[PDB]
Amino acid sequence: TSQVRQNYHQDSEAAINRQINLELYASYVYLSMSYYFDRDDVALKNFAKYFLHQSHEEREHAEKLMKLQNQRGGRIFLQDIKKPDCDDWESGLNAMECALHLEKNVNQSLLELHKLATFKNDPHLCDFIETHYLNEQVKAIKELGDHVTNLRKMGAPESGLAEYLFDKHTLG
Template sequence: MNMSVSKCRQNFHVEVEAAINKQINLELHASYIYLSMATHFGRDDVALPGLEKFYFDSSHEERDHAEMFIKYQLSRGGRVVFANIERPTKEEWSTALEAMEYALNLEKEVNDSLLKLHQLGSNHSDPHVTDFLEGKFLDEQVESINKLSHFTTKLKRVGDGLGVYEFDKELQ
């Protein structure tokens, strides 16, 4: 197969291109984890439809982020390289709080990756990639971390049982 070079590629360092491919994989991995969480909370023996919906929505959002990075990569003349998506290491959650804390840590991991990508773009004098990240991802990521932090605090406060049921109703 003949590997042609993109005609639109300009000031797009191969390290930035590779980091975007890693970010695509991380976003898909996060989507996969949230999908797993949604199915856990949707089970009849767990029956928390608000959390099920929240995690399904979160899964869709992460997949949308992956698609945004794919389209960006193509617009810059980069090549999208798909890697295996790591399966979730955990598929059972003993409490809603445990799952929410896991989600919070996942969002922090995604944020760290975005910040490293932003720094890489700066190091390679690529204002386009830094602007893309600032305009589409960084603020939203901080908001997500804040939202999940509030959710974990609420879940700690309400405890198990009826409190989780009431919290779940808020998410529906």
């Protein structure tokens, strides 16, 4: 065991050791979503960094995790960072959606990982959780909810001017 461990349960840190690779993938796809746009025939640069931002801000997410488990007597078990689902993510709107697809997910589990300490009696995990991560996605799911809305009304993916004026007046 450890010396700082207290009110910490092995079925809880096991989910923490599960959230860790769950944040690492998002970064890895976000990151795949970045350079997808660096490409010549692709060529929307301001998309990318939006996905490079939230891949970078993604990295501090995965750290704050690692911090608690140490804060709390949990060791750290690392397995593999799987490869993305697609490498060709097609449509300038496909990405925002596929992004939204994965933001819902973290937010789900994060609301599943919340309830676990709701009944193993760990209200400390109900502060660093109820404060540092929820509204993170709630506004991220909120933002990518206005984003996808706009391309569509712009006429995306059938409009090509949609992903230019976006990549300028929303992402500039």
